[PDB]
Amino acid sequence: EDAELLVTVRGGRLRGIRLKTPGGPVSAFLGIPFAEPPMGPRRFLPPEPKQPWSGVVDATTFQSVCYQYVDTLYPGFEGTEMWNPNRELSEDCLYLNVWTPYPRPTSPTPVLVWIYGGGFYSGASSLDVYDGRFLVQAERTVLVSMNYRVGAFGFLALPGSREAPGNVGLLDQRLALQWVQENVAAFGGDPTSVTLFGESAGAASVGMHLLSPPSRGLFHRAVLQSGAPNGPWATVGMGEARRRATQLAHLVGCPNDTELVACLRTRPAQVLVNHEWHVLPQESVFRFSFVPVVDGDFLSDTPEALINAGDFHGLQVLVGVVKDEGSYFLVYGAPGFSKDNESLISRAEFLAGVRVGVPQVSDLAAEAVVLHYTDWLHPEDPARLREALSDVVGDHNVVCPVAQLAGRLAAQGARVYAYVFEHRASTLSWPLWMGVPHGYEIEFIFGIPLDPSRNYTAEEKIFAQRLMRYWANFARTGDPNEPRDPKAPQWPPYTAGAQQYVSLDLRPLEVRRGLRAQACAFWNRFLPKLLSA
Amino acid sequence: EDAELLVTVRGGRLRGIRLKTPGGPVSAFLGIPFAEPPMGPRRFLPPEPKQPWSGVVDATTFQSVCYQYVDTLYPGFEGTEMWNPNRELSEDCLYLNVWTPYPRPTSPTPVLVWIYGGGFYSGASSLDVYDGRFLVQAERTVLVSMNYRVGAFGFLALPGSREAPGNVGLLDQRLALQWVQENVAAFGGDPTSVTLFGESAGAASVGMHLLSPPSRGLFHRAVLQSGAPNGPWATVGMGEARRRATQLAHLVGCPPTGGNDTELVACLRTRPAQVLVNHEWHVLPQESVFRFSFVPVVDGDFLSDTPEALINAGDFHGLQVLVGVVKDEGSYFLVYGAPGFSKDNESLISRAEFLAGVRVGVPQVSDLAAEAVVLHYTDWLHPEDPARLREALSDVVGDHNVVCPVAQLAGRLAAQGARVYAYVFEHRASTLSWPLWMGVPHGYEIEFIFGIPLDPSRNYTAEEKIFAQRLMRYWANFARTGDPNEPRDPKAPQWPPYTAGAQQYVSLDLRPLEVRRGLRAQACAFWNRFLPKLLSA
Ligand SMILES: *[C@@H]1O[C@H](CO[C@@H]2O[C@@H](C)[C@@H](O)[C@@H](O)[C@@H]2O)[C@@H](O[C@@H]2O[C@H](CO)[C@@H](O)[C@H](O)[C@H]2NC(C)=O)[C@H](O)[C@H]1NC(C)=O
Ligand SMILES: *[C@@H]1O[C@H](CO[C@@H]2O[C@@H](C)[C@@H](O)[C@@H](O)[C@@H]2O)[C@@H](O[C@@H]2O[C@H](CO)[C@@H](O)[C@H](O)[C@H]2NC(C)=O)[C@H](O)[C@H]1NC(C)=O
Ligand SMILES: *[C@@H]1O[C@H](CO)[C@@H](O)[C@H](O)[C@H]1NC(C)=O
Structure with a gap:
């Protein structure tokens, strides 16, 4: 039995997998649960920390992709498919992945945390193109990526209500950053040296963590590739969010915020996905329905304002x-x-x-x-x-x-x-x-x-x-x-x-x-x- | 007496002067009266045509410059003095000039008519730099230039009134243009081949003749140097014209604001020309050369619409x-x-x-x-x-x-x-x-x-x-x-x-x-x- 692939985190024990690269092996821990599955009554809610498990969680393969529209513009074309979900969809999708050198570092190692893009309507940490193994081997960092809820599951908001407060996808990301604070040391990572990087909506996410004080103490440095929290597509106001949440409800046969959210919770995930893109008349990849909301909580003001x-x-x-x-x-x-x-x-x-x-x-x-x-x-x-x-x-x-x-x-x-x-x-x-x-x-x-x-x-x-x-x-x-x-x-x-x-x-x-x-x-x-x- | 320097026009007889140019001799008739003097009661009115005269008018020198502000920004500096008036100022200034080859052309010749610039607040056809003699010698054309009233005297408007209708300066130019159609043939010029040309406010003036049908009959081609009628400075609306006219009147104690137009203008007519000029630049809070008080007005008469609209x-x-x-x-x-x-x-x-x-x-x-x-x-x-x-x-x-x-x-x-x-x-x-x-x-x-x-x-x-x-x-x-x-x-x-x-x-x-x-x-x-x-x- 290989000891290097057994790790204990606060919630229990994990068995990872050894990966090959042209430069040598790397230890990987894939599909680690860090939240309770946000299904049933937990849909639209902030993430709850994963309750401790007994026995050994299998962490040798990627877990499910969060529910999202699948792009069918050029079916079979490499250029579009490489961004498409490559595991089955599920609301049971809040998992993260850790790559680390083999054998595990015994002195604290800098940590890179990846946040994927996809316009806040798609994305997954399991895409081949986000494979952590080469970075880890070549630069001997620890690398972490998480899944976070997208589309309506992550950003539908009825501002002021506790049943759908908004930005829960951002909160998924934060929970993963908290997870990294408490557990990365078990993999050889230094929790005082965490660097966020992301692309597009991932970059916007990073920027929003910069601008939200409860997140800011969870990481040290930031990289933003081709994205920014202050882009015209990355946020929506409270009033417009409520309108959009309500419109999605009507489109799926739903009628008081409590009654509205309860009805949305009865609908299959695929139903919400199929109407997501039809809540706005002129809706596109640069004007998607469900994005981060500026509600005074996660973001106290607009990113433009907070930056200045x-x-x-x-x-x-x-x-x-x-x-x-x-x-x-x-x-x-x-x-x-x-x-x-x-x-x-x-x-x-x-x-x-x-x-x-x-x-x-x-x-x-x-x-x-x-x-x-x-x-x-x-x-x-x-x-x-x-x-x-x-x-x-x-x-x-x-x-x-x-x-x-x-x-x-x-x-x-x-x-x-x-x-x-x-x-x-x-x-x-x-x-x-x-x-x-x-x-x-x-x-x-x-x-x-x-x-x-x-x-x-x-x-x-x-x-x-x-x-x-x-x-x-x-x-x-x-x-x-x-x-x-x-x-x-x-x-x-x-x-x-x-x-x-x-x-x-x-x-x-x-x-x-x-x-x-x-x-x-x-x-x-x-x-x-x-x-x- | 020389027969080349004698010409009869509809008004009567003229005697001109023979000019020496480097390349040859040129006949010149300077200071031909084309309108009755816009003096006294005729201040602010349209030009009345020059009444016929007996005997011979000597058209042998430039006549007076129309009353205007004199630039004192850089005294003695040639760059500014070259534009300043070079004859005495007078309200008696509606004269034009004709240059023609020597000897007078035998077959009808192209006519160039010049309109000077000066922001509608200044200018004169007698400036050295507008000397027609070299153009006429070198290219064998007839050249004509006129004076026209400027500043308050040309463009103060109380729209709707008959005592100060506005655009009288432009009407001065039109009258000069009519004169050319009636009389330029007597100098060997072809009234069917008249080309207007001007610079700055002169160019804007040329443009407004294009867009005004009564003027459009009086010429055939146009040259616009560094100016256009659609420029932000070249026109003003009726209401704004009236505000400006009224403010100038106020600044000189007329009447002792607004009221009857007839009484207001009548009071204005008693003010010495120089007094109007001295107050003319203080009508607007921040007045400048690209924002002068008295410019052509869009009133539906001379211009039926804005020049931008008339162009399109x-x-x-x-x-x-x-x-x-x-x-x-x-x-x-x-x-x-x-x-x-x-x-x-x-x-x-x-x-x-x-x-x-x-x-x-x-x-x-x-x-x-x-x-x-x-x-x-x-x-x-x-x-x-x-x-x-x-x-x-x-x-x-x-x-x-x-x-x-x-x-x-x-x-x-x-x-x-x-x-x-x-x-x-x-x-x-x-x-x-x-x-x-x-x-x-x-x-x-x-x-x-x-x-x-x-x-x-x-x-x-x-x-x-x-x-x-x-x-x-x-x-x-x-x-x-x-x-x-x-x-x-x-x-x-x-x-x-x-x-x-x-x-x-x-x-x-x-x-x-x-x-x-x-x-x-x-x-x-x-x-x-x-x-x-x-x-x-
Ligand atoms: C370039 O192609 C676009 C897209 O049209 C599709 O792709 C082509 C390669 C071909 O397979 C077409 O039959 C496809 O429909 C063209 O834009 C389309 O033009 C047609 C013309 O009737 C119109 O019906 C579609 O709505 C247009 N689609 C879009 C997205 O605008 C475009 O004309 C092509 N450029 C050319 C021919 O110069
Ligand atoms: C450039 O000159 C202007 C004009 O000032 C006058 O002309 C100069 C050549 C010189 O002879 C000055 O003494 C003159 O006063 C300067 O702008 C003026 O500056 C003075 C004092 O600083 C001020 O009282 C005026 O209001 C200014 N006038 C304007 C029209 O702005 C300018 O500062 C000079 N630039 C230099 C010297 O670098
Ligand atoms: C202005 O006053 C004169 C002088 O009596 C008068 O004839 C004229 O009618 C008045 N104008 C108007 C517009 O009433």
Whole structure:
């Protein structure tokens, strides 16, 4: 019997599994229960801590995926399926996973906690692309990822009611962070050196933990990839949440908050999923029904407000974007777009595309967007129009929110490092015109190119190893730079003035200025003043 | 007595003077009365045509300049004095000038009619830089210029009243234009080939004649230099006109606010002309050169709608138009009010002076609008670079007041039938006395169009003389044929028409013609397409 695979946590005993990598074995503990299953009466409720068990919990395989819509846009296509659930769906899904070196560290080891994206309507910790084994082996950290409830199960809110308070998915994440505080030491992890990182909605989640004081004492450093708590898609107000919760009820045959929630609890999970996407008239991936609610509790004010009022001395943040943040999203609602042709669009389509990428704003506001993003020497060139709408969508939802976060955190005391990820994966199944699409830096951070059963190049393995080092450096010291390394070019902190960031791809680090400063001035400075008066 | 200097017009007989030019002799008739003097009871009234006279009127020198404010910003400085009045001020000023070749043309000749600028508060046809002699000698055209009333005397309006109807300055111009149709044939000019041209307020004036049917009969082609009727400064609404007229009246003790129009105007008529001029600039709280009190009024008479509206609604087939701007339209204006500016230093302004400058140069807009302007003109990678800020404030003022109005006009005329030719004048004069940072300022293409470098007593370079001759050729070609291009010259670079799509224009300087696209297209999209929509909601 292998002693290294037996661990005792506060709730009881676990048996893990040894995993192989090209660099040696790694210990893994998969599908560890950290909450009581949020089913029946516990649906829509905050998570209850897992009650202690007797005997040995089998932790050798991934557990169920939280209930979510399954994307059927391009069935069988690698580019979409790689994000789809790869275990059966279940409300019994609150499990987390621990990877650790083999044999287990005997001195305290820095901990990385991963939070997946998926727009708050999907995601799972078991996707192949979030495989912890290569990071752990190469950089000898402990790595933890959790599942958290999404869609209505995670973020349906009837503000003020105890039957559906909202943000319980965020609370799932917090419970896992509490779990890591109490138990990571049993795996060799140092609970005083926890680094959060996430992508997209995961990045937004990280940011919200930064801004919610009960979470802030559960981790030390943060990494936000292609996402930010202050993006226009990541939060909803109390009044609008109540409307949305009520609309979902009517759509599924449900009629007093107590009576409403009780009825929702009688409906099968699949029923709620099937109506989730129909609660808003113009509902898309950038305007989903059930997202984090600003209700004074988890978030005392809006993330914009909390950021501006914050004192962020003592915080190191790693933030960044991919080269083409908007391109991926265009095939999910923008007219004229497909992965199977060049997606050259007409100006009429461009104007319509703008109302989709920037939903629920006045005609005046939409007019300003079209003004800024039209080349008036070439107002109707189809190739330029495709790039422009990609930029509109990318800048409004990802780049400029991240740029704002970086700027404000820096000016208010955080040490910030910014990057733009510019390498297109040799294995990328999306079309050439999409460039470096949203979410395709992840496989490199997790070192998936080291898996020889996949078809990355020798250059890409070296590239992946660089990135894992930057990330792990940051997790250990708060500085991505090779702690002592003279001649290799240095990654400078991002500041509100100089606005310096580095480009990540096969070439060495290149320092540049401005995360699309001209465009982000439009989105971050002017356009809000417009939407008011 | 010489027979070339004797001409009979409908009013009676005239005697002119023979002018020496470097390239030859020219006949000139300066100071022809085309209207009864707008004195006493006729102050603020439309011009009455000049009553016939017996005997011979000597048209041998420039007549008086219409009453106006005299710029004292930089006394003795040639850059400002060259625009100031160079005859005595008088309300008795409605005279025009004719230049014609020597000897008088035997077959009908193209007529260029010049309208001076000066923001509707100043100007005169007698300024040295408007001397018709070189254009006439070099290109064999008839050149005509008129005086027209300015400031309160031309444009004080109490709309609806008969005692101060408004736009009388424009009516002065129209009367001069009618005079040309009746009498220019007597000088060998062809009344069916008349080309209006003007600069700044002169260009705006030309544009308003385009949009006013009674005037539209009196000419055939148009040239608009650095100005347009849709500019934010060139017109005013009826109610605002009345408020301004009433305030001026109040500031001079009339009556001893508002009341009967007849009594109010009658009281105004008893004030000495100079008194009106001295109070004229204090009607508005923050008054400037791009916001003068008395300008043309939109009242349904001379202009049936706003110039913007009349343009869009217009059918301009059969019309040829030549339009343009100088390279740095906004710089000249910055030393007349903007914080941190002077002709005597580099005028490197701070971020705060820039924000303050925007409010001055784009007057009376909401804070939202002022914000929008600051956004578009800030380089957010270098938000506080004083040189860049200076350039940007110059661009703000220039784009708002000249370039984008001219661009809107060009595009809309081209789309709706007119053949349009467009230029950017990029040459800085060697004799220029304004500081080097102003680049090519507003109004400094005029001396080249009028061929002033050919005057030996001025110290231009030989290249500038060549250049002046090129421009005179273009303008005169446009006048003759409706196309500034060299008839039957093939190897010479061609000047293509301006259209809404291609947006092509040529650069004019010492080098040959370079064709370019877009008259500050990105900036003007902002000023012409978006910024009005924001003022509504
Ligand atoms: C590029 O493709 C889009 C998407 O259309 C789909 O994908 C194509 C490869 C082809 O298989 C089509 O038959 C598919 O429907 C085109 O946009 C569609 O245009 C059709 C035209 O009738 C319209 O009915 C659909 O609603 C459009 N779909 C979307 C999402 O807008 C687009 O026209 C193609 N570009 C071209 C042909 O230049
Ligand atoms: C650039 O000049 C302006 C104008 O000031 C005048 O002209 C100068 C060339 C010099 O002769 C000054 O002494 C003159 O007063 C300066 O702006 C003025 O500054 C003074 C004092 O600081 C102030 O009282 C005025 O109100 C200012 N006028 C305006 C229109 O803003 C400006 O500071 C100069 N810039 C320099 C010297 O860097
Ligand atoms: C103004 O007063 C005059 C002088 O008596 C008078 O004739 C005229 O009718 C008055 N105007 C109006 C509009 O009543």
